[PDB]
Swiss-Prot record:
It comes from Homo sapiens (Human). It is linked to A chromosomal aberration involving KDM5A has been found in M5 type acute myeloid leukemia. Translocation t(11;12)(p15;p13) with NUP98. Chromosomal aberrations involving KDM5A have been found in M7 type childhood acute myeloid leukemia. Translocation t(11;12)(p15;p13) with NUP98. This is Lysine-specific demethylase 5A. It comes from the Eukaryota. The chain holds residues 287 to 344 of 1690 of the full protein. It is found in: Nucleus, Nucleolus; Nucleus. A zinc finger (PHD-type) spans 8-58. Interacts with SUZ12; the interaction is direct. Interacts with the viral protein-binding domain of RB1. Interacts with ESR1, MYC, MYCN and LMO2. Interacts with HDAC1; this interaction impairs histone deacetylation by HDAC1. Interacts with BMAL1 and CLOCK. Interacts (via PHD-type 1 zinc finger) with histone H3 unmodified at 'Lys-4' and (via PHD-type 3 zinc finger) with histone H3 di- and trimethylated at 'Lys-4'. The GSGFP motif is required for the interaction with SUZ12. The ARID domain specifically binds to the CCGCCC motif and is required for the lysine-specific histone demethylase activity. The PHD-type 3 zinc finger is required for the interaction with histone H3 di- and trimethylated at 'Lys-4'. Belongs to the JARID1 histone demethylase family. Histone demethylase that specifically demethylates 'Lys-4' of histone H3, thereby playing a central role in histone code. Does not demethylate histone H3 'Lys-9', H3 'Lys-27', H3 'Lys-36', H3 'Lys-79' or H4 'Lys-20'. Demethylates trimethylated and dimethylated but not monomethylated H3 'Lys-4'. Regulates specific gene transcription through DNA-binding on 5'-CCGCCC-3' motif. May stimulate transcription mediated by nuclear receptors. Involved in transcriptional regulation of Hox proteins during cell differentiation. May participate in transcriptional repression of cytokines such as CXCL12.
Length: 59
């Protein structure tokens, strides 16, 4: 709901020598997740806008 400090770029413990250069960031949530970090039907880096699990449920 607020990010006075930069935390909006986090995700699961994933990331060690991982694909994070493709890590997806939602509109303005602290819900950034890798394609494969969700149940993924999605891996193709979206050029447009992608929604976090929360957002897709209620939007
Ligand atoms: Zn991840
Ligand atoms: Zn979101």
């Amino acid at each position: 709901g607020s990010v006075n400090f930069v935390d909006l770029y986090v995700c699961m413990f994933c990331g060690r020598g991982n694909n994070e250069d493709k890590l997806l960031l939602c509109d303005g949530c602290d819900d950034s997740y890798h394609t494969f970090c969700l149940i993924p039907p999605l891996p193709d880096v979206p050029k447009g806008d992608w929604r976090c699990p929360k957002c897709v449920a209620e939007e």
